[model samples]
Target: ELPGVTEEALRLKEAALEELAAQEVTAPLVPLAVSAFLTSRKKAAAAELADWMQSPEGQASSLESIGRSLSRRNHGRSRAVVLAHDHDEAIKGLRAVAAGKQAPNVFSVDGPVTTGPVWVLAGFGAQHRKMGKSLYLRNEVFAAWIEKVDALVQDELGYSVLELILDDAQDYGIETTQVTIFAIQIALGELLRHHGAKPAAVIGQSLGEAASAYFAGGLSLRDATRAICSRSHLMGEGEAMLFGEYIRLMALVEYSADEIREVFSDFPDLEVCVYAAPTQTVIGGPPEQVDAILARAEAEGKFARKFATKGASHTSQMDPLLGELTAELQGIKPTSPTCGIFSTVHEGRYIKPGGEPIHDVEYWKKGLRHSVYFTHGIRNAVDSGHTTFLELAPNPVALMQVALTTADAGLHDAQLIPTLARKQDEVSSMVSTMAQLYVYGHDLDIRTLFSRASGPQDYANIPPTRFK
Candidate 1:
C-alpha cells in the first residue's frame, strides 16, 4: 500500500519487517519498525535503503521530519516561497498545479517588506502562554513555571516575572530583559525535556549560553539564573538587531562577514553582538543612534529588526560589567560537563584546541565582552561529530539556524528538530516532532507525552501513537 516510495524507503521497510520476523515478534511487525532496537549490520543494504521512517534517519540524508522532508534534494536550488500573503489560497493554488509541471515563473511583486527578527523571545513566551490556555500545555505546567520565575524575581527583584509575562510579555523593559528571556527559555527547555526531548549536545548564543551551561551540568538553575540576571544588569546599555526577515534569516540567502562589516562601518557606534548565522548578525549599541543605522540598512534594501533588551549583549558593550559578573560567578562552581558544550566565548566554537572544557568563570567573563560565534560553534559541533541539533528555546528559532548552519557545512544528514511551532497548534507541532524522533528510532522518554490527559483531546494524536 505504501506506493511510490523511494527505493531506500521500501528497502528499509522490508529490512525492518524481516528483522521483526527474525526476532519472532508477536507485536505488529509494521508498527514496531519504529522501535529503537532495530538495527542492520549489512552496511551496504542499510546504505542503499534508508529513510527517516527507519531508525537514526538516512545515514546520508536526514528528513526534516517524516511529513516534511526538504522539498528539493538540493536545498540551495529551492526558492523559499513566503506564504504570508493570502497564504491558504496561495497554498491551494500551488497544490492545483499539474503533476510534472515546473513551478510557475515567480517574480517579486515589489520590494520585499524589510523583514525583522523572527526569533524574539517575548513573542515566544506570549505564544506559549496562549498555547497553555488552549490546553496544548497543561495549566499546572505553566503555573509551576510561573512559580519558579516568581521565586527568582521575588528573591531578586520585587514583583513577579509572571506578572510581567502576563501583563505585557513584550514590554518588560531593560532590567527584566535577560531575566525574562532566561526564565522563559529555562521553562521551555524543561518543558521540552520533560516531553522526551533529549538533545545529544547543547550550545547557546550569548545569554543563551547560561541555559546551555545549566543543561551541561556546569551551572545550577538558581546559580545560572542569578548569573544571567546580574550580567544583564551589569551591561550598561545594549540592544540586538537583525538585518533580514524570515527568508533571509532561514539561510535562503546569506550575508558575508564583509557585507555585514560594511553596515557596521556606517553605524560605527553599533557593535556586532551574536554571530548567529551568515545572514543573521545581531548588532548591539547605545539606543540613541541605532535607529538611524536601522533606517539606513532598510534604505539600502536590507531589513533590520531589533531585539528586546535593556543593554547590548555579546559585545564590548558588556565589558564594564565583567569584573562584577566575574565576582558574582565566583561563588558558583561550574563543573566539567556531562555532555559537550561548545563555548560562544573561548573560541566562539566547540572543539577548541586540546579539547578544553568550559568550566572557568573567566570564560564567562570573556564571553560577556566577545561576539557569540553561534554559527561557528554549530559548525564545529557538527564537524566534531555531533550532528543532531534541537533548539532549547521556547520556539524553533535555534532549530532554523542549526538547519542552515549544518546545510552550509554539507552535513545534510544532520537532524534538525524544532520544539514549537510558529503557526500550527502547539499540540500538533509538539507531537509531530515527538513522533518524528520516535519513528526514526531516536531514544525518547515519552512518559510525559503519554500520561497527560483530561483536556479536549486532539483526535489526530493517532499517528504519534497508533490505532493498535
Candidate 2:
C-alpha cells in the first residue's frame, strides 16, 4: 500500500465513491471515479492502472463506454471537460461541479474574446545567474531566437554572449551582461508574438529601450545589436575610468523620491534613478553616499538593499559618455514604429508615429544619461487604454512596477502577466501565463501550445463532449 493511504483516506474514498455512484457516469465524473479507485490500490497496481489509462487501448475502451452511455442518456449538448491528475485537484473539480462554479483546470473550447490592447514592457539591469537557461532548454522558439541573437552579438563583440550568460563564472564584463539581457528580451518578445499574443505597444526601463526600439520596428536586429554593443562598450570605457575613484550603488529604499532627496539633502551628487512605485525608489550615487543613506534607512527601521552592479546607469556619471554614445549610434537608421513606443526618459510622451525619428542617436544617448520614469510611462500606457501589461524579460522585474502603477492609479481591471519566471518550470510557466491571458479575453492560437514539434493538428481521437 502507499505510505499515506490511511484508514481515514480509505473511508473518505468510499464516501466519495458512494456520492459519485448516485450521479450519472458523465465525462466530468471520470476523474472522481479514477481518484477513488487509485486511493484503494497498492503502489504497483496503482502504477499499472495509471499507465494503462494513458495507453491507446485503454483510452479507446473508456471513450467507447462514455460515448455509449451518453448516447443512451440522450445528452445531446456540448460541454467543456477537465482532466484531473491528483486527488486534491479531483476534489476541487467535484466541488466546482456541485457549486456550479468554473473549474480551475477547465476552460472554454471556443476562442477567447479579443479585447483591449496589450503593452509589452521590458526591464533593464536585472540579469541573474543562468538567466535564460530554462527557456533555452525547454522552448524551441526561445532557443532559436537566442541562437540568432547570439550569432549577431558574436559578430559584433567577437565572443559568445550565450556562454557568459549560461556559465556561472562572474568575471565576464558588464558589456556581456547588457548584450545578453537585450538578447533575452528580444527572444521573449518574439516567442510571445509566435503564440499570437502581439503587443499593441512597447515600453522599456533604462537599458531596455534598445529592445523597445527593436520591437517597435524602429530598428533592425543588426542595428539594435550594434547599438547595444556600442552603448555597452562606450559605457564600459567610462566605467573603467572611474572604477577606483568612484563606485555606483543602486539601493531600494522604502521612501518616496522627495523623501529620499530630503534624507540625502547634503549629498547633491546622489540621484534618484528610478520611480518604480510610490514608496519604492531606486537611488544611485557614490558608494560612500549610498551606503550612508542605507545606514540611515536601517536606523529608521525601513527596508533597503543594494543591487549588484559594476557600473551606475541612468545617472550623472553617464553624462560625459553621451557624446560617444551619440556618435556611435549615428549610423543606425531609425524608422516609424509599427506600434506605440512609450519613452521612460521623456515622461508622459510616446514616440509619435509620423513625427521626426525619436529613436535616433540623441534619443538613445538621453536614455543612457537620464533617469528612468517607468511609473510615468506605465501611467501613460493606461491612459491610452492599454489595459494588459506583459513583462517581456527573463524574470518578472517590471510587473511589480506595472502592478503598483496601475493599483495606485485605481485601475483595478488591468492585467499584469510575465512571460518567464525565475527558477521555475519554463514551459509550464509560459503555458500557465498563456492560459491566464486566454481566460482574460486575449485571443491566442491555442493550437500553438499543443503542437510545437510537429504542425498543428485537430483533437480527433478525444471523445466529443456530451452534456445537456
Candidate 3:
C-alpha cells in the first residue's frame, strides 16, 4: 500500500469495484475511466490517452466497448486510482452521465453566479515549510514562473528563492521568507492570468503590497522583487532588533478593533495592526506585550494566537526602518495602474485623483509602518462594484477575511475563490477554482489548465455542445 493510503481508501476501492461490476450498462464507466487514467498517469500518458481516445481505432471501438475494456482491467482495484470519498455522489454522476443527463467530461460542482468585476487579493505573513511545492511539481505554467522568478531573485539577491522554499535544512530567515512569498504570489498570479481570469482591481494585506503593486502595473517585476528584498532586509536590521534579540511580534485576536484598543490602552507598545474583519484583528507589538495580550484574550475565552512572524509589521515598530526602506526604494520608478489598486495602508484608493502616484517610495515606507485597513479596502472594492475576489496566494489566507468583510457589508452574492490550497493537489485545486470562476460568468481559457502539463492537444472526441 502507498504510505498515505488509509483503510478507508481500501474499503472505498472495494466498494467502487463492486458497484462497477453490478452496473447494468457500461457507458457510465467511460467518465470514470477517463478520470482514472488522467489522475493516475504522467504527462506522456495523458497525451497518449488523449490521442487514443480520438483516433479512428478509438472511434471504431464503440463507447460501450471502451467501457467494457476499462472494466475488464479492473482499474478500481488499483491503489493508484483515486476513488471519490463520496461514494453516493460518484455513483450519481456516473448514472447521470450514462443516462445522457450530465456532462461526461466535467465534474459536478456549483458556485454562486457573480455579475460584477473581479478583484485579486494578495496575502502575506502566512508562510509555511512546503508552500507552493505542490504547484511547482504539478503545474507547468506555475513552475515556469517559479523558475523565472528564481532567476530574477538570484540576479538581485544572489540566492535561489526555489532553494529557500524546497530546502528544509536552511534557516528561512525573514528576508528569505519574504522573498519566497513574493515569488510564489507572483507565480500564482501569472498562472491565473494565463488561465484568463483578469483582475479589475488588486488589494494587498501588509507585506503583500509589493506583489499587488506589480499586478496593478504600478511596479515592474524587477523593481517589485528588489523592493521586497530591501524591505525584508531593512526590517531585519539592527534598528528593528535590540541587543541581538528580535523585539517585534504579532498576534491574531478574534475581537473587534475597538475592543482590542480598549485592552491595548494599557500597553503602550501594543497596537491593533490589521483590521482583517469586523471581529478579526491582528495585533503587533513587542514580544512580551503581544504574549500578554494573547494570554489575556485566552483567559477571556477569545480565540487568539501568535502569528509566525520574525518582526511586527504594520505597527509603530516599523517606524524606525521606514527612512532607510524608503531610500532603498527611491531608485525604482512607479507608474499609473492598469487596474484599480485598493490601498490597505492608506485605507482608500492607492492613487489619488490629482494624478500623483501614491505607490512611490514614500507610499511603501508608510505601508511598512501604518496599520493595514484590510476590511476598509474590501469595503471600498465592494462599493466600487467588485463582487468576485480571487486570492493570489499559495494557500487561501485572505479568502476568509474577504468573506467576513463582505458579510459585514451585507453583500451575499460575493464569490470568493482561492487559487491553491495547502496540502491539496495543486492542479485539482486550481481546476476547482477555475470551475467556480467559470460558473460565475468569468471568461477563462479553460484549455490552459489541460495543456499546461504537456503541449496543446485536440479534444476531437468530446462533444462540442453543452452536455444535456
Candidate 4:
C-alpha cells in the first residue's frame, strides 16, 4: 500500500498481517509475536523469539522480538558510576544494548536496603565536575547558593568559582581549587536541605570536611572560606594516588612495622595518606615517589588510579604547615553544629555540635596528617544509631564505600542514596532517588522535590528498575 515499497516487501507485510489474524492468545506480547511470526525470515533465533513472545520472561525474549529489551542488572537505582574514557565508545555501547545485542542494567540488586534516622554525608570534591552543569542549570535553589559561592570566590580571590569551573577549564592552583570544592559542596548541601534532606550527623573526607563544617552550621561562610584558603595554600607539596581494592589489605599486604619503616627509611618524606577500604588505599609523597609507588603497585597486578590533586594531603608532609595554619585560624571562632559530627581523625570519638574538639586547632592539625578512619567513622555511625547514609556531593564517588561499610556492620535495610549521576539527565536522576527513598519509608520531603520547578521540566521520564 505504501508508495515507495517494493512488491516482495509488500507481500511480506501482507503476510505478517495475515499471521496476526491467526494468533489465539491474548496478552501484551501476543499481538506483537503474531506480527513477527509471519514477517520474520526462517531462523532458529527468530523461532525462539516467537516462543518467548508468548510469555512474560527473558533472553532471546519476546520483549526483544517485540522491540523491548531484557534488563535485570542492578536494582538500587543509586548505584555508583565510574567515568568512561572513550566518549564515542560509550555512546556506541549504549546503542548496541538498545538494539538488544546486549543486556541492560537495573539500578540495584542483591541486598537489604532500608534507610532511616541519621543520614551520613560523604563528599567527593573535583570528581563532580564531569556533569556539574547538568545539575546547576536546571535547579534554581541550587543555582542561588552556587552563585553566593561564586561571589565569595570573586571577592576573596580575583576569579569566580563559576568561571574557573565552567569556562576556563584549566588548573586554578591550590587555593582556588579548594574554593571550587567549597562552592560546589556548600551549594549542593543547601539544595539537599531545601529538598527536605536534613543531615542528623555528618563526616567528611579530604577537603570535604570544610563543607561538613558549613553544613553542620558550625562556622560562618566567611570563616570557612578563610580556613580553606589557608589550608589549601599551606598544604605540603605532594601527590595522592589510589590503588584498587583488595580483600584484606592489612592481612595480605602487611609488612612488619619495622620492615615498613625500613623500606621507606630512605624516603622519609613519604606517608600513607588514607585507608579508605580493605582493598583501596592512598599514598602520598613527592610526585615522583607517588608515581613510583603507583607503578610498582600496578605492576604487582593492583589497579592504580591517580587524582588531579596538586599536592599531597593528610600526610606528614603537612606537618610543617600545621603551625602556620593554626596561626591563620587563630581569630576564627566556630560554633556548635545542630547535628553530631563524628571526627574521623579521632577514630571512634563522637563530638556533639559545638564540642571543643570540633572547634580546636589541634584536632584539625592531626586531621591533616592522620589516616581517615572512614571505615571506623561509618561503623560508629551505625553503632551510634544512624540508619541512613546520603552522599552529598557532585558525583556518587563514595557510594560503594559507604554501602560496603554499612553492609560490613551487619546493618541491612540501610538506605544508601547518591544525589548526582555522570551521564544521567539531572532532574530524573534526583527524582528517581527521592522516590526510591520514599518508597523504602525514609523521612524525605517528596512534595518539594516535585514542586521545586515552576513548570513542567524537560528531563526524560526514566523509570526506576523493578526488582520483581
RMSD of 1: 16.4
The TM-scores, one per candidate, come to: 0.59, 0.74, 0.72, 0.62
- Which candidate number would show the highest TM-score if scored against the true structure? 2
The CA lDDT at 104 in model 2 is: 56
Task: Name the runs in model 2 displaced over 4 angstroms.
Answer: 1-117, 165-173, 240-244, 352-356, 452-468
In the order shown, what is each candidate's alpha-carbon RMSD? 16.4, 13.9, 12.2, 16.4
lDDT of 1 by residue, 57-115 (tens): 22222121211222112211111221111223223223322121223211111111121
lDDT of each: 0.49, 0.65, 0.65, 0.53
lDDT tens digits, residues 1-468, model 4?
112323443454355446546767332211110111211221223334333333343322322122211112222322211111222222332333223343222122222234343444444443544345545555778767877776665555455565545442444555655667677778777776776766777877766777777777777886777666667666523222223321001111222224335546655555666556545566566656556656665677766676655555676656667888888777776787777887677774677765653645665677776767676777788887776677766567676777767787788766676776667666555655554454344555544543232322211111122233
* Pairs of residues clashing in candidate 2: none
Q: How much is the lDDT of residue 286 in candidate 1?
A: 59
List ranges where model 3 is wrong by over 4 Å: 1-120, 238-240, 243-246, 308-310, 350-356, 452-462, 465-468
Going through the candidates in the order shown, the clash numbers are 4, 0, 0, 17
Models sorted by TM-score, best on top: 2, 3, 4, 1
Tell me the lDDT of model 1 at 284.
64
Worst 10 residues of 2 by lDDT: 31-40
The C-alpha local distance difference test score for the whole of candidate 1 amounts to 0.49
